[PDB]
Amino acid sequence: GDNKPADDLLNLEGVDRDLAFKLAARGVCTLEDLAEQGIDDLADIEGLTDEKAGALIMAARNICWFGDEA
């Protein structure tokens, strides 16, 4: 993952240091970039489930979109 994931992605619960590289190597170098991904888009990832992808992507969206407020 030359792109390297942002600390938000690495420190985001649900994403291990490895998935961070698996996500950063896919163009998502920041947690916000993950909020733009879809369960079907991350479905190709390895170790990610359809329900987990909905939460992982929602975890970044909640922090990137709703933010700490929610």
Curated annotation (Swiss-Prot):
It is found in: Cytoplasm. It comes from the Bacteria. Sequence repeats lie at residues 14-64. Signal peptide: none annotated. Participates in both transcription termination and antitermination. Monomer. Binds directly to the core enzyme of the DNA-dependent RNA polymerase and to nascent RNA. Belongs to the NusA family. This is Transcription termination/antitermination protein NusA. It comes from Shigella flexneri. The gene is nusA. The chain holds residues 426 to 495 of 495 of the full protein.
